[PDB]
């Protein structure tokens, strides 16, 4: 429960600042101690993932053809299917969130800023609900910060 809210805040803040072209955001009270360092790490690693995988991200975004809220809702099916296929690791978790930021930037360009918070919830549901046991074993977001040790 606490992990869900903490994850939702980190993911929501990162998607929102990526879409508005911001490098920071105010804490919303649910991310706690680990929140600041997690978002700082996610900005570093996440920005890098979007840069290094830009052609693949542009290709997939185009194929997904996201124009509105109904299209955003439809993403959860493929999101859970792809994210559940294969190994669990921090690298894949960053790819999931980074693609979310890449989609959020797209949503802002097409005046669909209202879809960003629903998308963050979609991503948080997939991440936390399918990886809760693994996240607990890694000490969640403290594990994330330590793994990348930026
Ligand atoms: C959507 C999809 C993805 C694939 C993998 S091939 C594309 C591809 N090539 N490379 C080299 C990379 C890095 C990707 C790629 C592109 C986009 C996302 C991912 C993911 C995360 C899981 C799927 O996440 C989402 C699916 C849909 C909408 C989403 C909207 C917001 C946030 C996440 C979303 C991975 C991975 O787990 O390794 N890899 C990704 N197949 N499909 C159908």
Author numbering: 172 to 321
The study reports:
Three subsets of Bcl-2 proteins interact to determine whether cells commit to apoptosis. Although the pro-survival Bcl-2 family members share several functions and structural features, the distinctive regulation of Mcl-1 makes this anti-apoptotic protein unique.
We then tested whether 4 could occupy more of the BH3 binding domain of Mcl-1, which should lead to improved potency. Indeed, we observed an improvement in Mcl-1 potency arising from the additional pyrazole substituent (IC50 = 0.042 µM). It is known that additional interactions could be made within the BH3-binding groove of Mcl-128–30, but it seemed that the pyrazole substituent would not extend far enough to reach the P4 pocket. We hypothesized that constraining the molecule within a macrocycle would deliver an entropic benefit to potency, if the solution-free conformation of a macrocycle could more closely resemble the bound conformation (c.f., what appeared to be a somewhat unfavorable conformation of the linking atoms in 4).
